[PDB]
Design a protein around this ligand. Sequence first.
Ligand SMILES: Nc1ncnc2c1ncn2[C@@H]1O[C@H](COP(=O)(O)OP(=O)(O)OP(=O)(O)O)[C@@H](O)[C@H]1O
Ligand SMILES: [Ca+2]
Lengths: 362, 13, 139
Amino acid sequence: TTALVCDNGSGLVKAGFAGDDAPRAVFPSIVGRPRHQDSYVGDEAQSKRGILTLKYPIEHGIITNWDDMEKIWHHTFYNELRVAPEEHPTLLTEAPLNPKANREKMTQIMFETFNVPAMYVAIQAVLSLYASGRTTGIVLDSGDGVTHNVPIYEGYALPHAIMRLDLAGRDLTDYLMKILTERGYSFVTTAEREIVRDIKEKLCYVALDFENEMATAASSSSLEKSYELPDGQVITIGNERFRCPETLFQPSFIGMESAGIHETTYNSIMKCDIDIRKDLYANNVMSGGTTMYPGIADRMQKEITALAPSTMKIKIIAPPERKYSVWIGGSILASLSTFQQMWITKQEYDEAGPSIVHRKCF
Amino acid sequence: GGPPPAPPLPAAQ
Amino acid sequence: AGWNAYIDNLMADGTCQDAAIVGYKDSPSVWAAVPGKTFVNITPAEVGVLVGKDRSSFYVNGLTLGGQKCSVIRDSLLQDGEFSMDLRTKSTGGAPTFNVTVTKTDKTLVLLMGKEGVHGGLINKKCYEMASHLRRSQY
Ligand SMILES: Nc1ncnc2c1ncn2[C@@H]1O[C@H](COP(=O)(O)OP(=O)(O)OP(=O)(O)O)[C@@H](O)[C@H]1O
Ligand SMILES: [Ca+2]
């Protein structure tokens, strides 16, 4: 039949069928339960948020609430895709460096609760690399809850070399709220946060040279944009437009001690085999919603060029469809003849138990 | 000197 | 019994091109291996790398198994419950490359190399099952 592909993110679930060119269902990874003494998922939970307590079962790409995660999976199969999971081999995705115990539990739930006939867990960044038609390269994957640099050799992620930055789209929304508030606007509430996320996604950009852009912003109004709020009134956004995603390059902006995404790209490459470094620099692929800022590829190109040896060939690949590259790469990978050997079958789970995922999925 | 004796193989399935 | 039967067993299903059982205590040696391939030529030095104290240097620029260059993908060789290292060979000028697993028992290393296109998970799973068997037998 048709394999399923389910990419569970911190902010958004992307689900659908292997062989399709896009996920059929994309919806918030939220589960709501009544505020007072059953449950809603996704768009309905958001719509009914006034009478629910909303929780995000995935935090920084890692599943942390197993009861609510099972509600997400049940909703995805039965309500969004309208399939019986016992009928479909199921490809799931996981964060880079997802703990052993977690991937075991994922495996156990799929076989024991959902009775899938087969399943596989792939690293999200690895699927984005497949989406770009490559099996060797280094991926920067940046979503709503977490950012990673993941170097990959012949479709195998290299965990010793993986870098994590615990800031991504949600942090950037909050920071933009903070700095617009410093400016004099009031954005504090949940509904106001949603507006700011919209301002972020429509008007922000990554400056080529941050310090110069700050000097420019200060010297004329060519960089200002106006934004019309739901109520109707129109507001002005200035250096905030590029100061917000600058946080990716300078985590000190939100008081994090971590190096920026360009620096961690370099450090990741430098943890890998001397023999594959040239291939990594020539195959940098951007993935995830938070890599959608205008100017980010140019800035990465500039920053990596400065870090690398002076004659290194450097290429940054930033696909237009990169909000969904992880899902798309799962659809591509599950459609390959080479993948049919990779499924963990129910027979293999029966013989080995949940730790089969450590043998089979890497 | 040489390898020790080999133990019996797994059950044939 | 003897150790050659282990090679017969490992190679039976056609998914591997090479297989070896190597004693790693004292003076390491191959106990059995596919004739005329790669693992049959593993050296005591290469064994020492696999099992040694340093779990970082083989990331600067890989390691060798019977002269064959490999990159380390996962290293859990000294970790309870896993006892495995996964590797992928490195080749010059797009010649094919292959996945390898090494698992560690009380007295041996079991090594397996897949044929072209065989996924590292099949190799890992086979190598792990044979290591588990050997450990149950105090080997
Ligand atoms: N055009 C855009 N510019 C900036 N950010 C965007 C854009 N489009 C989406 N985003 C952000 O991308 C994020 C979601 O992307 P994505 O689906 O990749 O994350 P996820 O998978 O939910 O999370 P994670 O991978 O971190 O667990 C949101 O924070 C959203 O605000
Ligand atoms: Ca994601």
